[PDB]
Amino acid sequence: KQLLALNIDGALLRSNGKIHQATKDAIEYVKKKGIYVTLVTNRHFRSAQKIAKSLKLDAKLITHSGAYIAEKIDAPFFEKRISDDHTFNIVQVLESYQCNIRLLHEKYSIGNKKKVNSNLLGKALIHPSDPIFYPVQFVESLSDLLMDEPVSAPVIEVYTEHDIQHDITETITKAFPAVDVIRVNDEKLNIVPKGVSKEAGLALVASELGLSMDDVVAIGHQYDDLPMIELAGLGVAMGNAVPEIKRKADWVTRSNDEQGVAYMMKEYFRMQQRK
Amino acid sequence: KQLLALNIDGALLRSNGKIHQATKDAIEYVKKKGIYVTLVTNRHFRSAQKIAKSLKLDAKLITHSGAYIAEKIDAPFFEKRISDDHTFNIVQVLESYQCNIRLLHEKYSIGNKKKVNSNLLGKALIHPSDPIFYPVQFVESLSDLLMDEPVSAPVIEVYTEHDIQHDITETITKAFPAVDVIRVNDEKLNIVPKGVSKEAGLALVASELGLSMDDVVAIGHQYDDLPMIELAGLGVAMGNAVPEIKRKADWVTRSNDEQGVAYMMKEYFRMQQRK
Ligand SMILES: [Mg+2]
């Protein structure tokens, strides 16, 4: 294998947001062996890049659910975003539902203030804004703000109770042919430009490197990771993934709180040594 | 003539920052006659675009001294910026001089806190930051900040007393072949990527429209406007420009506090009617 692609949340990071020393040591070793290491994430580019900096990756990172692929923010390798007018229209529709909305731009994030009965929203790791490089604000009315401040969003994140996800998904897919809806988990959807995804972004990076998906190890933990797990040469589910995802993977490793990334890569190399 | 290009500061705007009703009326008339109206400015893109919105321009605007040409911020027609490493190195050199430095990014601006004996700095119109869309911050040490927060700047603005401009200009030009130094006035320099300028940006826009510089009316007021004044089919100096600029123009109009833009365009049309 020639390319290792890792989720950040639920894989690289422990549930307290720390990167374990064993994980750092495993990634350093992987790189020393000539394997290209990148991140494949729903996180905004800036958060992903600071993590990459900690791991000394110097790689094209696949961020904003595949909509933004870059090594340095001002000069992306691949970018796609929802038009400002479509973003406004989508926000108006979502405002009629009980859902928390976040426009996840690479330069800032803006969300509404609607409270939802969602525990995964409560569990999700919060990471810093920066008042210059990444302001994060909430407003009571997103669509009112967008009237005078249009936003062209690479990703719109939608948190809800599970009961209405199918309806929101149907309503958006039908009304907006320019976007796709990606189910992340029971309480979170990403709305992205049509054709954008983690697996599509990963394919673009592998192709750029002269590799195929056959040459890729992909490590994921949620529903939106399933396609890259199925399509990669070796698709790995973290121990903290739900049972369905674990059944669908080629390989199940330990959890993100038990250094499952390091554990899996140690075995990958033992396998190499045996062969 | 087919294309009207206007400065914002010192031309479109009165010295109190207001756009006079006569100016609005003149621009509406120009557009109704089929003439393409755009802005050519040292201002950051966002400030230029809000002004364009007020004038209902819907045009490609030439901003950041020609480094950023766009109708909508996320999707530029033309962009060039100084690399992050060159930006850092340039800032380090400038820090050894008595000068106020501002990194004029399209998403934010960051400057140092050095005080200079400069009245044109005192006179220059301040326009709003926005905590989401355009944060503006000052730090004691720009180069220290850039160590952990690299910036790839379309323009670096440098304010000084007049006595050291030549030395700074020489030092930068010699040390950084990837950039050009543009003298704006006796107390302000812009450092831009090589080949970037107001006149170059204007040429790119005219070419995109199937026009030549011959078809352009350009209205400017400072040293950095001289090339487009000389190169445009009709180059106009505002009344508030210094005498040298007024001598070099084809036509001198009234000042920005006496509606010189409106006054000049009224004559342009009287000329048309006579012909
Ligand atoms: Mg861009």
From Swiss-Prot, chains A, B:
Gene Ontology terms, MF aspect: magnesium ion binding; phosphatase activity
Keyword Glycoprotein: no
Description of what induces expression: By phosphate starvation, via the PhoP/PhoR two-component regulatory system.
Domain of life: Bacteria
Alphabetical list of InterPro entries matching this protein: Cof (IPR000150), HAD-like_sf (IPR036412), HAD-SF_hydro_IIB (IPR006379), HAD_sf (IPR023214)
Pfam families: Hydrolase_3
Keywords: Stress response
Protein name, UniProt field: Stress response protein YhaX
Organism: Bacillus subtilis (strain 168)
